[PDB]
Each structure stands twice: as C-alpha cells, then as structure tokens.
Subunit: 249 residues, 2 copies
C-alpha cells in the first residue's frame, strides 16, 4: 500500500531528524548560506585561532578528531537504526553485525551533506575546514579526506534531501550480505520494504529525475570502495592515553 | 513522560547484553544448576587448581594477574557500554576519560557480584568456579584481596536485581557529576538525572513489591566506593612486597587518582 510505504518514509525521516543534530538542509544553509558564518580554517594560523576561539602535532590531532567525530556518529546512527521497523526484532548478533559493517558507509554518506567542493563543515557547523588545508597536511594525512571529497561532489549532484537520505541510510544498514549474519531472511525482507519506500519516495520527491533510484543504488559501490580505501589508509597510520585509545579501538 | 524513560531503559539493556558476554542471567543459570552442559569445574585447592588449568611461579601471583587481565578486559567492555549511554560520547573527551577512570572499578565490582555466591566466584567466562575459601587461603597479602568483594556481593545480591536493572544502575555510576577533575559537571548531571529517573521507573515496574529498592540500591554505591578504596590500598601493598609483579598500564593509569 503506497500508504504503508508513505508511513515508513515519514517515520524514518522523523527518526533521522531526532537522531542527527546537523542535517543536510541545515548544513546546506550554512554552506550557501542563510545564520552566523562558520569559522573558516584555511591554514595553520586559522586553526590555532579557531581552536582558541572554538572547540602535539597538528596533522595527528585533526585525524584524531575525525575519529572522535566518527565515534559520535556511530551512536547517532546506532540510535537511528533502532527506530527502523523490524531492526530491534532481529537477532542481537545480527544487529551488531549490521551496524559494525554499515556505519562507515553511512558516516561518509552523511558527511557529503557537510561537504562542498572546497571544504567541509566541522564542530556541528561552527567551523568550515578547507579542502585545500586538509590536502596540505603532511603524509599520510594529506590524502584521508580527498576520496570523501570526490565522492561527495558526485553524490551531492543527486541533490538528495534529508527525507531521501533517511531511507537510503536505512537500506544500507539492512544489507543481507554483511559477513557473519545468522539470519539473512528477515534482513532482506525489511530491506525490500525499505527499497520500495525509497523508490516511491524519490518518484514523488524528484519526479523529473529519471532513474534517480538506480543512480543512488549505484553510489553504494562508490561508498564501499571509499570505506575499503580508508581501512587501508588506517593500517598505514598504524605505522605512524591507554583508555582514550580504548574508546576509539 | 515515563514512555521516554522506558525507551532509554530498553536501549541500555540491549547495549548491555551486546557489551557484556557473561550476563547475570547466564551466571545464575551456571551457579544454580540449571545445567548439564553449563557446569563449572571447581577449584577449591592447589590440586584442583592444577586440574583446572587442564580443562579451562607462585599461585597467589598467578591468580592475581589473571584477575587483573580479566579486569583489563572488563575495562574494555564497560568502555564499550559507556559509549552507548545517550549523551556520553558527546561530552568533553577529557571528562569522558575521567568518568571511566573513576567509574570502572565500581562497575567491575557491581558486575562481579553477578558471578558470586557466598561459596565462590565464577571464572573464565563461567567455565570454572573458584571457591571463596581457597581465595581466602592464599598467602598474605593476597588472601584477603577478594573477601570484601564477596561480602559486598552477598549483600548486593540480596537485592535480586536482574540484568535490565543493572544496565541502568551501571549507567548511573558512570555518569557521576561529583567525580574529581571534571570540566563540565552540568551536562553530566543532566544525563544522570535522566538515568536516575529511568532507574526509578525500571525498579518500580520490574519490582512492584520491592519497597524503596531504589534508595537501597543507591545506598549500595557507598559500599562500592569503599571496596574500591580498600582495593587501591591493598594494591599499593602488593606492588611493594612483589617488585616482580607487573600491573597493566591501563590499571596503573586508572589507580593514579
């Protein structure tokens, strides 16, 4: 019943809005942008001044922060997943499994919302870090962001919005291919529903955008590549406080 | 609204099950004999201790190290759980470190009671059971190292809490505003306020008969603190008597105060 679907969509959206503080509309507005400009971090002095005004070696602290941020996001995402109908009824191991392998894909999805071709919003919108400043950092820290920027420019050309992204995100989480899943069938049963809901959503929200659905699903490919590429970079950083380390694992 | 507090209770219980492999429900099933496949090997003496190693350098020292490596793991499990507490992850990163630093031993001894009866304590993910008397036998200063924990457990287990209750209790312990050296007390207190309210409701619904369970549970926090202090004291003794015993940096970091 397109109406069963319409309800799923709305619910996921409302859950999305509750779960994630900085949304795409909000991010867009600040980028474009509607109120107070964000503090702009375009080099080392700006960074130093930024930090004195707002919330060791520089390159490392920025790479670590990106971690604190990804940990935050894991919890937001994890809370969002629990709003997805069916999710909490799956085998607990499988919920853990679904999150474990899906979070990074969703982090980069959502981080596109905060990126344009020149920088990326940070500190929940208070700062803006330039692409060129991040690219400047000494190796291997000059490269970590750059594949996210190239994905984000492509992904943002879809001009998806928050209501679309809410459903896409849920589709990701419910991937029945994740390794180690105990009971794939309810996962795919839900995803299949999420897919119908996303498909109908994009037909109604972008009636002019031919095969947007398919195009968005094709981007999943780009996302996995990015994540795979990042764990690869990460092992290399493993070649560069006990308790704080435990937090980021 | 109560409804929110219930949502939060369920979320925490769920994380707790995910974060902690040996729940109280599993430990009691092993302890009470709801088992044919779940039965533990019992160590009540040196001889039995040796047989135990078979199917699971002085003894006392060994037993103590194992206890510290298990504690180091538990630090990890609790840290994992901690990240699940709504708001925790958002707090200043230094405060997050502080709350864990001062919370983890309290939590450790809370969750240990789960694994204890008056006779002894489960070990090795519950495949073994080390009697209280054996642990008491050990050469000084180790002989007394567990005893205060047993005494607390015997008393705390008298509350008959289950995993869904401890999940919230533990949360409350972590999000303590009073902890020393905290940068932003307010955002911590607000979270604890919630958790306390979640806890109160949870005990009311789960234990409708149990009058003032909430207060009695909160009072227990007092004996927890004291266990931790005595333990810290005993550790300073052991580090001095045994110059050849190594204490994990994590734990050494935590004991710094």
């Amino acid at each position: 019943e397109s109406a069963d679907l319409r309800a799923l969509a709305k619910h996921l959206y409302d859950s999305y809005i509750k779960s994630f503080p900085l949304t795409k509309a909000k991010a867009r507005a600040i980028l474009t942008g509607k109120d107070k400009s964000p503090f702009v971090i375009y080099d080392m002095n700006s960074l130093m001044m930024g930090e004195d005004k707002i919330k060791k070696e520089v390159a490392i602290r920025i790479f670590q922060g990106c971690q604190f941020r990804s940990v935050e996001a894991v919890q937001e995402i994890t809370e969002y997943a629990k709003s997805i109908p069916g999710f909490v009824n799956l085998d607990l191991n499988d919920q853990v499994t679904l999150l474990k392998y899906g979070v990074h894909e969703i982090i980069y999805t959502m981080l596109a919302s905060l990126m344009n071709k020149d920088g990326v919003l940070i500190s929940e919108g208070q700062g803006f870090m330039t692409r060129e400043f991040l690219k400047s950092l000494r190796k291997p820290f000059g490269d970590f962001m750059e594949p996210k920027f190239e994905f984000a420019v492509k992904f943002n050309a879809l001009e998806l919005d928050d209501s679309d992204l809410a459903i896409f995100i849920a589709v990701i989480i419910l991937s029945g291919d994740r390794p180690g899943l105990l009971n794939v069938k309810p996962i795919e049963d839900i995803q299949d529903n999420l897919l119908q809901a996303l498909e109908l959503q994009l037909k109604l929200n972008h009636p002019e955008s031919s095969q947007l659905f398919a195009k968005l699903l094709q981007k999943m490919t780009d996302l996995r590549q990015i994540v795979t590429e990042h764990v690869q970079l990460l092992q290399v950083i493993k070649k560069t406080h006990p308790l704080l380390q435990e937090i980021y694992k």
